[PDB]
C-alpha cells in the first residue's frame, strides 16, 4: 500500500526552473564570466534567419528581403574564403539582420509555384550543413533529420542525388514530410531521391555500411533553447530523468553507427544543440575510441579554425573547445547555441 504521509516532500519546480538550475551549476564553471552573457541570450527570444528556398523565385525573394535591410551573410562569407588566405556547401542563401537588430521576418508567403518563398530557421543551425562541404552527385545520410531544420537545407543545395532522412519518432517524421511537401516540389520527392524513414539510427551502422559519402549526425540532446521556454515534453522533468541519464550513452551509439555507415574517405559532421561539454566533446571522443577498440576504425577530425574566422562577424564562437566548434548565443547575435564537429573516415 502506498504511503501518502511523507514527512518531507521535495518542492515542485517548473520544468523551466528545473532546466535553469541544472544549467546554472554546470555552465557557470564551463564558461566562467561568459555564462551571464550567454544566459540572457538563452532566456531572450532567438533571432530567426530567413533561408531562401532555391526551388521558388529565389532571385525575387532576395530582392524582397533586401528591402527589409536583410543581409545575406552566406554570400558575404563566401567572399571571405579568399580574404583569409574543402570549401563549403554551395547554393545556400540565408538572410539575417544586423548585429543587435531585433527586427523579425514576416511569415513566409507561398509563391506562384505553390511553394513557400523562404524558410525561417536558426542561423547557427545552417553552419553544420555548410561545414559538411556538400558536393554534387553525393549520397547524403541524415540521422534524426526531422523536423527538417538541416534536412531542408540539404535539398536547397541540390548536391544530393539520394537522401536518407531517418528519425525515430514518427511524429517528428510526419512534420518533416509536410515541411518538404510545402517547400520542395513533388518532382524531386517523386523518386527515390528523398527517402524518409522512421527507424533507430543504430541500425544504420549495420544495414548500410560505407554506402554514403557525406553523413550528418545530429543526435538528440538537452536543447538549452527549448528547455528554458517550452513546458511540454521537457527532458528535465522527473519522469524523463531516466532518459537524461542515458542521453550521453545514446549520443555515443548513434554517432558511432553513422561513422560505420559512411564510406572511408567520406566526411561525417556531428551536430548538437547544447552547451554541455560532457555531451559535445566527450561524445565525440567516445565514438572515436569505440570504433578503434571494437571495429578498428580510425577517423580524423578536421580543423574548423579556418571555418571559425569566416563567420566571426555574424556569429560568436567559443575558443576553448578541444575538437568541435561551439557557437554560443549573444544579445547582439542571438543565433545558437550550436555545436558542430567535422570528422572524416580513413
Amino acid at each position: 500500500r502506498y504511503k501518502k504521509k511523507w514527512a518531507a516532500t521535495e518542492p515542485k519546480f517548473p520544468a523551466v526552473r528545473l532546466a535553469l538550475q541544472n544549467f546554472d551549476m554546470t555552465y557557470s564553471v564551463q564558461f566562467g564570466d561568459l555564462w551571464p552573457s550567454i544566459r540572457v541570450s538563452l532566456l531572450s527570444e532567438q533571432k530567426y534567419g530567413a533561408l531562401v528556398n532555391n526551388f521558388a523565385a529565389w532571385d525575387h525573394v532576395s530582392a524582397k528581403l533586401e528591402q527589409l535591410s536583410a543581409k545575406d551573410f552566406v554570400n558575404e562569407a563566401i567572399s571571405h574564403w579568399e580574404l583569409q588566405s574543402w570549401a563549403c556547401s554551395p547554393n545556400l542563401r540565408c538572410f539575417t539582420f544586423d548585429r543587435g537588430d531585433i527586427s523579425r521576418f514576416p511569415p513566409a508567403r507561398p509563391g506562384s509555384l505553390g511553394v513557400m518563398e523562404y524558410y525561417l530557421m536558426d542561423a547557427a543551425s545552417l553552419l553544420p550543413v555548410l561545414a559538411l562541404g556538400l558536393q554534387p552527385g553525393d549520397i547524403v545520410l541524415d540521422l534524426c533529420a526531422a523536423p527538417g531544420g538541416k534536412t531542408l537545407a540539404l535539398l536547397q543545395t541540390g548536391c544530393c542525388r539520394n537522401l536518407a532522412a531517418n528519425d525515430l519518432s514518427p511524429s517528428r517524421i510526419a512534420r518533416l514530410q509536410k515541411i518538404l511537401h510545402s517547400y520542395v516540389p513533388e518532382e524531386i520527392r517523386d523518386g527515390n531521391q528523398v527517402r524518409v524513414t522512421s527507424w533507430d539510427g543504430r541500425k544504420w551502422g549495420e544495414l548500410e555500411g560505407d554506402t554514403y559519402d557525406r553523413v550528418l549526425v545530429d543526435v538528440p540532446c538537452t536543447t538549452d533553447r527549448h528547455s528554458l521556454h517550452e513546458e511540454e515534453n521537457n527532458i528535465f522533468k522527473r519522469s524523463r530523468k531516466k532518459e537524461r541519464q542515458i542521453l550521453p550513452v545514446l549520443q555515443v551509439q548513434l554517432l558511432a553507427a553513422g561513422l560505420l555507415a559512411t564510406k572511408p574517405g567520406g566526411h561525417v559532421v556531428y551536430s548538437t544543440c547544447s552547451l554541455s561539454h560532457l555531451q559535445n566533446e566527450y561524445v565525440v571522443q567516445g565514438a572515436i575510441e569505440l570504433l578503434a577498440n571494437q571495429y578498428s576504425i580510425q577517423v580524423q577530425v578536421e580543423d574548423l579554425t579556418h571555418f571559425r574566422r569566416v563567420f566571426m562577424d555574424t556569429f560568436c564562437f567559443f575558443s576553448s573547445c578541444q575538437v568541435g566548434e561551439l557557437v554560443i548565443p549573444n544579445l547582439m547575435a542571438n543565433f545558437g547555441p550550436m555545436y558542430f564537429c567535422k570528422m572524416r573516415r580513413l
Binding site: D24, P36, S37, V40, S44, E45, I102
Partner: protein
C-alpha cells in the same frame, strides 16, 4: 479624495506604516500624480518579484523612480543571474546587489559595477523587453 485614495492604498493595499507613509510623501511627491493602478503595480513588483520588504522601500526611495527603468534593470539582472529572488524562507543563494546601487547609480555605472556587460548589449535588451511588454499588454 484623490489624495485620500492614494494614502489609503498605501496604508491598506500596500500596508505601509503611518510613519513610513509620512516619510514617503515628503521624499517622493510623485506618488500623488501617479495612477493608483500603476502605483500598486510598482509596489508589488518590489515586494514579490524582487523580495523587498516595507522598511527597505521607504529608505531606498523606490517609488520615485519610473516603473519602466525598474523593469529594464531588474529583469536584465535577474536574467544575468546576478540577482536571485528570495525563496519562501527569505534566504538567497548569492547576496543581491544593493537596491540603491541598481537605481540611484547611472546606467553607465550600473552596467560597470554590477552587470559587467557591454553598453551595446543592454540597448538590445531594452528593445527586446519592450516588445515582450507590448505583447504582454495585448495578450491580457
Amino acid at each position: 479624495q484623490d489624495i485620500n485614495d492614494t494614502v489609503r492604498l498605501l496604508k491598506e493595499k500596500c500596508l505601509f506604516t503611518v510613519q513610513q507613509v509620512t516619510k514617503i510623501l515628503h521624499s517622493c511627491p510623485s506618488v500623488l500624480r501617479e495612477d493608483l493602478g500603476q502605483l500598486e503595480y510598482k509596489f508589488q513588483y518590489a515586494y514579490f518579484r524582487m523580495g523587498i520588504k516595507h522598511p527597505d522601500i521607504v529608505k531606498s526611495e523606490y517609488l520615485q523612480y519610473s516603473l519602466t527603468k525598474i523593469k529594464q534593470r531588474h529583469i536584465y539582472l535577474e536574467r544575468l543571474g546576478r540577482y536571485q529572488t528570495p525563496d519562501k524562507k527569505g534566504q538567497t543563494q548569492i547576496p543581491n546587489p544593493l537596491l540603491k546601487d541598481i537605481l540611484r547609480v547611472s546606467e553607465a555605472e550600473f552596467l560597470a559595477r554590477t552587470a559587467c556587460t557591454s553598453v551595446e548589449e543592454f540597448q538590445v535588451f531594452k528593445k527586446l523587453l519592450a516588445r515582450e511588454e507590448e505583447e504582454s499588454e495585448s495578450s491580457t
